[PDB]
Amino acid sequence: THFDVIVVGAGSMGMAAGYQLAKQGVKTLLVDAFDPPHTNGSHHGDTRIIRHAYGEGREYVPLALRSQELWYELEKETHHKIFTKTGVLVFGPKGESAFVAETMEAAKEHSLTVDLLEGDEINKRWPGITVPENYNAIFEPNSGVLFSENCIRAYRELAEARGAKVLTHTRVEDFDISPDSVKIETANGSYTADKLIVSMGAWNSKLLSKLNLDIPLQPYRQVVGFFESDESKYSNDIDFPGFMVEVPNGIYAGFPSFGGCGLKLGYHTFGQKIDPDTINREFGVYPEDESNLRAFLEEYMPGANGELKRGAVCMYTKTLDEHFIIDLHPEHSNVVIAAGFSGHGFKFSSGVGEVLSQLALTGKTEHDISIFSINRPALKES
Ligand SMILES: *Cc1cc2c(cc1C)nc1c(=O)[nH]c(=O)nc-1n2C[C@H](O)[C@H](O)[C@H](O)COP(=O)(O)OP(=O)(O)OC[C@H]1O[C@@H](n2cnc3c(N)ncnc32)[C@H](O)[C@@H]1O
Ligand SMILES: [Cl-]
Ligand code: NA
């Protein structure tokens, strides 16, 4: 059967696209290598931060705010848990964090509700945090934490109820694009449609070449660990925040303990360069997996440095500028590309789904997506 739209990669971005398309009666096929949500891509490890005041650049704020509303809509539509409003704390040494400074500028430019704190005010407000006196902070009370695997699962179940079809455990191997249709090849058969969305996460870095694109898209191995913690300090129940912070040796991001699961941490600015089909997915096979996390905890969050309860291994896919790619294919207006989310895309996946549906159906979007152009110079090596 010929579909209206085919989505290749039914993960964070593709499943949201599928939901958006199905809700409008568009006959959609989604094809995934696995059965999402799963532990082989970029969406597992339970939780994701959503921030509105945005240290990567104030121009992300409108998409973050739209995405936040879309997450509240999803919460109301499903029985799965979507969002909890932890707030997000950002801190770093005063005068020495571009990330903190841009977060602060973004909040001012968009009139976001934030608290500004410094030094011992941080340690007093949130027992369990120990920063130096020369640190400053911005705290965003109304952002928080998404349950990412639940988000994809809910979008899948809602899309399928409206007639979207999901073909699981099926790798797309090649493409054939014509002026008025698209075709995909798999070991389980070939499929056609009017429009294609390409959203294969870390595998975009290997398979966009089949669409005559050569864009730097390096996959990275990124681990997270959950640690036995002082629940009187680090529980969501006592208002411990989500956080993303800059210190001299890089950026870390973490989560309060939910229901006793332990504080979760990741080192965001370091990971191993990998290939998505040979990555070692076991936490702890490199000493740095656990040691880089405890180096942070023992200094800044010392009561959250107990036994390792759980570890996960997940992938980032970076562009050279660490901004996303969301655009039509430059040679094929019936092909939409979502790639290069550079370790910070999940929070936008609801809004991106809307963008991708608009691009597929109309060739345009009401959102300003200029900074995500596939033709920008900053994507290309010298
Ligand atoms: C790994 C990670 C990411 C991350 C994070 C922490 C970790 C450890 N913390 C974040 C946070 O707190 N807040 C946030 O906003 N983002 C954060 N991220 C990044 C975010 O998770 C990613 O940017 C995002 O998940 C990327 O989504 P995308 O949709 O691009 O990738 P995916 O969910 O892995 O989905 C891709 C799908 O494609 C399928 N696939 C692959 N190859 C094929 C072929 N050949 N054919 C068909 N399907 C294919 C995959 O199976 C997958 O389902
Ligand atoms: Cl990513
Ligand atoms: Na984040």
Author numbering: 2 to 383
Structure paper excerpt:
The Tyr254Ala and Tyr254Gly mutants exhibited enhanced reactivity toward cyclic imino acids by eliminating this spatial interference. Crystallographic analysis of the mutants revealed an enlarged active site, which facilitated reactions with five‐membered cyclic imino acids. These mutations disrupted the electron delocalization associated with l‐Tpr, thereby eliminating charge transfer and substrate inhibition.
